[PDB]
């Protein structure tokens, strides 16, 4: 029940023990070299197996 | 409330957004000295006028 200016869709998959990693500020294999989710992250994290 | 008195120590041990959190304790308190400072000086401010 909210407009944005734009949203835009990072498509990409992981591992089943790596989902843990994605997260504001968190660190691992997946999280400090390939996808650094920020501290301010005004968006939204879904998963699918 | 925070680990510990000095800004170094927390940006240094803790991560950045635990830090977030226990910078702020610091920022919140110590604003409190100064709002406590102040305000006391206000009033000495009136019994010197």
Do not use: H, M
Not at chain 1, 17 to 24: C, H, L, N
Not at chain 2, 15 to 43: F, K, N
């Amino acid at each position: 029940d909210l407009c944005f200016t734009n949203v835009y869709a990072d498509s990409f998959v992981i591992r089943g023990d790596e989902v843990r990693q994605i997260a504001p500020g968190q660190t691992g294999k997946i999280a400090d070299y390939n996808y650094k989710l920020p501290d301010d992250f005004t968006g939204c994290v879904i998963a699918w197996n | 409330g925070a680990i510990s008195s000095v800004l170094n120590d927390i940006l240094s041990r803790l991560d950045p957004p635990e830090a977030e959190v226990q910078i702020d304790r610091l920022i919140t308190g110590r604003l409190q000295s100064l709002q406590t400072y102040v305000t006391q000086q206000l009033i000495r401010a009136a019994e010197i006028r």
